[PDB]
């Protein structure tokens, strides 16, 4: 086909955990979907202690924004590396075929930009990440990763082939950071990216993250930024981890339908308590809320969740169902 | 429904790896199933070296006992925290919906008790664990976790929808412990739970267990406490890990039918050598023994199994089948 | 049956990542397939730094060679431990039933040999490894593991039951090594296997590999030993990890059909980006190449891949498809 004959649509991305507007069932034929991302290297405070790192981001956030297209759309990404940055960057889409997912074609020095197009031939949620030759894990584990969702053109389906339609979608990007520690166990600090590199590699080689966070920081998806829903709403949570395994769990709920490894031609796993998203993968879980109140959404290595940062909240509005759960005798001495 | 119109049945739990009496196919309509558990904080020796920890238990054991109900039964748990204990505790059922799985409704100080009811709306094996706000992984990794099995009312089914019936069931709870170590690598000891807490958190944050055990101690499922079977028997092994991934394997056998993430509405995986149970999950594997002798049942990170403790035995009685395996030439010099 | 009435076929194995000649669909009835392996303890350089370890091998390689049979063939292995070796060895086949997978029947001192026969009753790819009582992880993590493929007699099938036929097959064995480190972080060296043992156990107990490699060394599957394919070829990659989880990923491609836990009676997972092979398992992924150029095949813990060694290359020949991917605007300043 002459791709120039296809419709074009532009999307300005939104900051995670929110997701740009889209339609589950495709309302048009195949399109070229145009996205622009601007790389930003920036300081970020990642914990309650005030630990500040030099993050490497797509569009200013950790994770980068969720892109949404349909199967056999074309993705056309304009990637900009402003001259205010220091490092070389590129992008690898796990959704794409060829050229190291695009990384071989998108190397941009500060002051440069590029435009890549690929055909989204497989439905699913997929990781994207920076991957400069020779320095790949340093960029990924500095926050330079996100995800793309390639919906089937007829939307999602259950294990029987019947439609599943979400009312709300959220994108939780989970980030392992490796802040270098000294003999005493104290975090070390660095003056330039080049002076940081060897100790960054040493810290990564421990295979022991210092922080594991959702949306870029301890507690980011809590408080005024808790996720929200109403009783009876159907919610899809897309979860990615570009480098390390995770095991999501909704405390007080389930994954009613889960694509743990994220690929929608497969039937979902039903009624999951907890599911394994391998490092380098995006997964998706669908749940219909049945009770109001606070939920915690966690990586169910509970050390990772409650000590290292991999925990967020939902605040759910609505009616309490005493058939489903009740306190028969409240805590008391007798 | 008026739950007061339903039958009630009481169960006194039994110590793992054994499981209280039940029927696979439900012989009654939906019931309220009454369980009582008494929390016991106690010293436990966890290894052959004599390392003694302060364990936190449901009903005196690590893991806590397996509860068995059927889909859409109600579980009514009386949870008792005697005044001989020191700490606050509660319970979160991954089988339940709402209130952090029950944890928000079951906080009991020493000297208190509570009764929780929930409807078991999803079939599967599920983790339960203590989860006091702000101290969750410390309680879980001190042994305060178990599992509940919610059987379909028509029992288990294979990948084709035909019945699978077990002759024996065992519950293997796998526990990661994090005994604090000093600079020399030596275990540290503590006088009160409060004096222990910070170094417990530091040890957990290494993400490196010091011990990984079945049924509470190195070698617990060996010797006079090896698991047993006969050739031709169908055995279900329920395996849980509340905090960390495991990968069970029957050395000399297989998982003929495996629900690795434990949820029975899904078809089982067939003929598994090894399967991944994510931390925060229970799984179940069904096997028909075909050869007698000693088997080892392990976490197949063999360091975890044979150095850190995650290994038990089966002793199987019966006929040897030389068609299936034989020594053609016994080890010899020639 | 009288096994003596069956055909016998002898196979001389080939060095990974190549695989001995075989037929996907069985061209004969059930056979006794005869294999011989000679154990070799040898020094191996495992990294670009020149780090040299004392490896324990089947047939001189890490991993050991891939054996290929069909379901309900018999495998007859002659295992030789020459008197030039120092240690006791044996073999455990995860494909086999009974006697700890054969390990109880195959213990050979230096100067001894043995012949084991077993029936390959379950289709799939499976790990085999040495497992001497009391020293199991030391042998496995010194390289003494490989895999066996038990093909269905009618070859591989997709999720719909239609045939899948590979044009090329490769075997990637992934090895975690634990070279002991001193206080300074420097590798330690040892004069005899007995003098090495305690520090080998200590290093293993860190659960932190020093090296994670394909085909026995950093960079082994690169350069003149890169894997190869042509555009349009169907390639099966069998991947094993006898001790530790891995998460394979083809950078620039996918797993079109993946048996992540390796057992062919199950339907494959479709369109995977990344898949989890649990430690103690072999998996298999099928892909049809669609673009030429260099691909990296990695464990997608990118630290494990690019810092610790778990990365190889494909070099793919053929036509570039600009519909699938193109550079619209090459990197430039504007
Ligand atoms: O970029 N990770 O959430
Ligand atoms: O800017 N280099 O492709
Ligand atoms: O039940 N979640 O910890
Ligand atoms: O140190 N982790 O939030
Ligand atoms: O939305 N329930 O009141
Ligand atoms: O909950 N009233 O005892
Ligand atoms: O409590 N864990 O076996
Ligand atoms: O004892 N407090 O719910
Ligand atoms: O074959 N189990 O180590
Ligand atoms: O030190 N583990 O049994
Ligand atoms: O139970 N077999 O003799
Ligand atoms: O096993 N007899 O040589
Ligand atoms: O032996 N492992 O590649
Ligand atoms: O050489 N011992 O079986
Ligand atoms: O996209 N692989 O790093
Ligand atoms: O130190 N690893 O190649
Ligand atoms: O094989 N493609 O030119
Ligand atoms: O790629 N030409 O601007
Ligand atoms: Cu970058
Ligand atoms: Cu990648
Ligand atoms: Cu507790
Ligand atoms: Cu939990
Ligand atoms: Cu050996
Ligand atoms: Cu094994």
Which residue, C127, C129, C282, C304, is CA-closest to C218? C304
> Which residues lie below 8 Å from residue B183, measured CB to CB, with a gap of 6+?
none
Report which ligand 13 atom has the smallest distance to the Cα of C144.
1
First to last CA, chain A: 78
> Which residues lie below 8 Å from residue B23, measured CB to CB, with a gap of 6+?
none
Q: Which two three-digit tokens encode residue B96?
A: 């339940």
Residue B47 CB: number of other CB atoms within 10 A?
19
CA B269 – CA A133 distance, rounded (Å)? 39
**C291, C304, C328 ranked by CB distance to A116: nearest:** C328
- Strands A32-45 and A8-11, by their bridges, are parallel
State phi, psi for B186 to the nearest 5 degrees.
-90, 145
* Separation in Å, CA A195 to CA A183, A192, B284, C167, C289: 19, 5, 50, 48, 40
Which residue, A313, A317, A247, is CA-closest to A285? A247
- How far is it between the farthest Cα atoms of chain A? 79
Active site residue B54: no
DSSP B157: E
**Gap from CA of B323 to ligand 8 centroid (Å):** 62
CA A16 – CA B171 distance, rounded (Å)? 41
Which residue, B187, B169, B170, is CA-closest to B178? B187
Alpha-carbon dihedral angle through residues A239, A245, A250, A254, given to the nearest 10 degrees: 90
First to last CA, chain C: 78
DSSP C267: P
Cβ atoms of residues C131 and C280 within 8 Å? no
DSSP B108: B
Burial A227-246 (b: 16+ CB within 10 A, else e): bebebebbbbbbbbbbbbbb
**C302, C320, C329 ranked by CB distance to A140: nearest:** C302
Q: Which two three-digit tokens encode residue A261?
A: 């490894």
Interface test with B, best of C6, C278, C283, C284 (most B CBs within 10 A): C278
Catalytic residue among A54, A249, A256, A313: A249
Domains of chain A: 1-152 (2.60.40.420), 153-319 (2.60.40.420)
Place of tokens 């008391």: A332
Deposited resolution, Å: 1.1
Burial A313-328 (b: 16+ CB within 10 A, else e): bbebeeeeeeebbbbe
Q: Which two three-digit tokens encode residue C202?
A: 């200590």
Cβ atoms of residues B140 and B130 within 8 Å? yes
Judged by a CB distance cut-off of 8 A, whether residue A184 touches chain B is: no
Cβ atoms of residues A251 and A295 within 8 Å? yes
CA C327 – CA C317 distance, rounded (Å)? 19
CA C334 – CA C332 distance, rounded (Å)? 6
**Gap from CA of B41 to ligand 6 centroid (Å):** 26
Rg (CA), chain C: 21
Report which ligand 5 atom has the smallest distance to the Cα of A230.
1
The H or E element that residue B23 is part of is none
Interface test with C, best of B182, B252, B319, B323 (most C CBs within 10 A): B252
Q: Which two three-digit tokens encode residue C70?
A: 């069909």
CA B194 – CA C184 distance, rounded (Å)? 34
CA A28 – CA A193 distance, rounded (Å)? 45
DSSP helix/strand/coil, C234: strand
**Cis peptide leading into residue A63 (ω within 30°):** yes
> Which residues lie below 8 Å from residue C12, measured CB to CB, with a gap of 6+?
C20, C36
State phi, psi for A50 to the nearest 5 degrees.
95, 10
Cβ atoms of residues B215 and B63 within 8 Å? yes
CA B172 – CA B312 distance, rounded (Å)? 9
DSSP helix/strand/coil, B7: coil
State phi, psi for A35 to the nearest 5 degrees.
-125, 150
Which residue, B255, B226, B249, B243, is CA-closest to B94? B243
Cβ atoms of residues C111 and C89 within 8 Å? no
CA B30 – CA B32 distance, rounded (Å)? 7
- CA C50, B307, B224: angle at the middle one, nearest 5? 155
Which residue, B76, B84, B74, is CA-closest to B39? B84
DSSP helix/strand/coil, C188: coil
CA A45 – CA A24 distance, rounded (Å)? 35
CA A72 – CA A145 distance, rounded (Å)? 23
CA C276 – CA C246 distance, rounded (Å)? 6
Cβ atoms of residues B273 and C283 within 8 Å? no
Q: Which two three-digit tokens encode residue B2?
A: 């008026």
Judged by a CB distance cut-off of 8 A, whether residue B201 touches chain A is: yes
DSSP helix/strand/coil, C257: strand
* Separation in Å, CA B275 to CA B127, B307, C135, C278, C325: 17, 20, 23, 7, 37
Interface test with A, best of B74, B107, B207, B260 (most A CBs within 10 A): B207
DSSP C119: E
- CA C201, C205, C206: angle at the middle one, nearest 5? 125
Helices (H), chain C: 136-140, 193-205, 302-306
Catalytic residue among B67, B144, B149, B204: B144
CA A146 – CA C315 distance, rounded (Å)? 28
DSSP for C50-98 reads: --EEEEEEETTBSSPPEEEEETTPEEEEEEEE-TT--S-B--EETTS-S
**Cis peptide leading into residue B63 (ω within 30°):** yes
Which residue, B298, B280, B310, is CA-closest to B46? B310
State phi, psi for C101 to the nearest 5 degrees.
70, 15
How far does Cα B14 stand from its chain's mean position? 13
**Contact between chains at A244 and C301 (C-beta distance less than 8 A):** yes
A-contacting residues in B 13-52 (Cβ below 8 Å): none
**Contact between chains at A252 and B206 (C-beta distance less than 8 A):** no
Q: Which two three-digit tokens encode residue A158?
A: 């259950």
CB of residue C160 inside a 6 A radius of ligand 18: no
Strand order in the sheet with C227-230: C227-230, C311-317, C293-299, C248-251
Cβ atoms of residues B75 and B120 within 8 Å? yes
**Stated length of chain B:** 334
DSSP helix/strand/coil, B223: helix
CA A18 – CA A169 distance, rounded (Å)? 7
The H or E element that residue B43 is part of is strand B32-45
Residues of A with Cβ-Cβ distance to B124 under 8 angstroms: 271, 273
CA B106 – CA B103 distance, rounded (Å)? 5
Which residue, C74, C244, C239, is CA-closest to C150? C74
Three-class HEC string of chain A: CCHHHCCEEEECCCCCCCCCCCCCECCCCCCEEEEEEEEEEEEEECCCCCCEEEEEEECCECCCCEEEEECCCEEEEEEEECCCCCCCECCEECCCCCHHHHHHHCCECCCEEEEEEEECCCCEEEEEECCCCCCHHHHHCCCCEEEEEEECCECEECCCCCEECCCEEEEEEEEEECCCECCCCCECCCCCHHHHHHHHHHHHHCCCCCEEEECCCCCCCCHHHCEEEECCCEEEEEEEECCCCECEEEECCCEEEEECCCCCCCCCEEEECECCECCCEEEEEEEECCCCEEEEEEECCHHHHHCCCCEEEEEEECCCCCCCEEEEEEEECC
* Separation in Å, CA A215 to CA A47, A212, A246, A284, A300: 12, 10, 15, 16, 17
State phi, psi for A326 to the nearest 5 degrees.
-155, 155
**Gap from CA of A143 to ligand 19 centroid (Å):** 9
Computed from CA positions of residues A295, A246, A138, A35, in that sequence, does the dihedral angle turn out positive or negative? negative
Catalytic residue among C130, C135, C149, C204: C130
Cβ atoms of residues A222 and A236 within 8 Å? no
**Contact between chains at B278 and A247 (C-beta distance less than 8 A):** yes
β-bridge partners, A229: A316
State phi, psi for B101 to the nearest 5 degrees.
70, 15
Number of the ligand closest to the Cα of A103: 15
**Cis peptide leading into residue B27 (ω within 30°):** no
CA C98 – CA C101 distance, rounded (Å)? 5
Computed from CA positions of residues A219, A221, A224, A229, in that sequence, does the dihedral angle turn out positive or negative? negative
- Strands C311-317 and C227-230, by their bridges, are parallel
Q: Which residues of C are annotated as a binding site?
A: 89, 94, 129-130, 139, 144, 300
CA C158 – CA C234 distance, rounded (Å)? 13
CA C282 – CA C293 distance, rounded (Å)? 27
**Cis peptide leading into residue C115 (ω within 30°):** no
DSSP helix/strand/coil, C324: coil
State phi, psi for C265 to the nearest 5 degrees.
-70, -15
Q: Is A168 exposed, middle or buried (0-12, 13-18, 19+ CB in 10 A)?
A: middle
Q: Is A129 exposed, middle or buried (0-12, 13-18, 19+ CB in 10 A)?
A: buried
CA A281 – CA A94 distance, rounded (Å)? 9
Determined by X-ray
């Amino acid at each position: 086909v002459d791709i120039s004959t296809l419709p074009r649509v532009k999307v300005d991305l939104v900051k995670p955990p929110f997701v740009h507007a889209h339609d589950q069932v495709a309302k048009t034929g195949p399109r070229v979907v145009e996205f622009t991302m601007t790389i930003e290297e920036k300081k970020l405070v990642i914990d309650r202690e005030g630990t500040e790192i030099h993050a490497m981001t797509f569009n200013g956030s950790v994770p980068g924004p969720l892109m949404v297209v349909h199967e056999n759309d074309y993705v056309e990404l304009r990637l900009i590396n402003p001259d205010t940055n220091t490092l070389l960057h590129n992008i690898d889409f796990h959704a794409a075929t060829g050229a190291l997912g695009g990384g071989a074609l998108t190397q941009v020095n500060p002051g440069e930009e590029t435009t890549l197009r690929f055909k989204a031939t497989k439905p699913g949620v997929f990781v994207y990440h920076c991957a400069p030759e020779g320095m790949v894990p340093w960029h990924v584990t500095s926050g330079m990763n996100g995800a793309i969702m390639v919906l089937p053109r007829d939307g999602l389906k259950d294990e029987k082939g019947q439609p599943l339609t979400y009312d709300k979608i959220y994108y939780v990007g989970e980030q392992d950071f490796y802040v270098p520690k000294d003999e005493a166990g104290n975090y070390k600090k660095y003056e330039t990216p080049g002076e940081a590199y060897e100790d960054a590699v040493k810290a990564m080689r421990t295979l022991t993250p210092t922080h594991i966070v959702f949306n870029g920081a301890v507690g980011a998806l809590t408080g005024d930024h808790a996720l929200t829903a109403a009783v009876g709403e159907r919610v899809l949570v897309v979860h990615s981890q570009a480098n390390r395994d995770t095991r999501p769990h909704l405390i007080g709920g389930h994954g009613d339908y889960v694509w743990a490894t994220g690929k929608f031609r497969n039937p979902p796993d039903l009624d999951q308590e907890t599911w394994l998203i391998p490092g380098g993968t995006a997964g998706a879980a669908f749940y219909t809320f049945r009770q109001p109140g606070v939920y915690a959404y966690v990586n169910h290595n509970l050390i990772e969740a409650f000590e290292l940062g991999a925990a967020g909240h939902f605040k759910v509005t609505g009616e309490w169902n005493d058939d489903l759960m009740t306190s028969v005798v409240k805590p008391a001495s007798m």
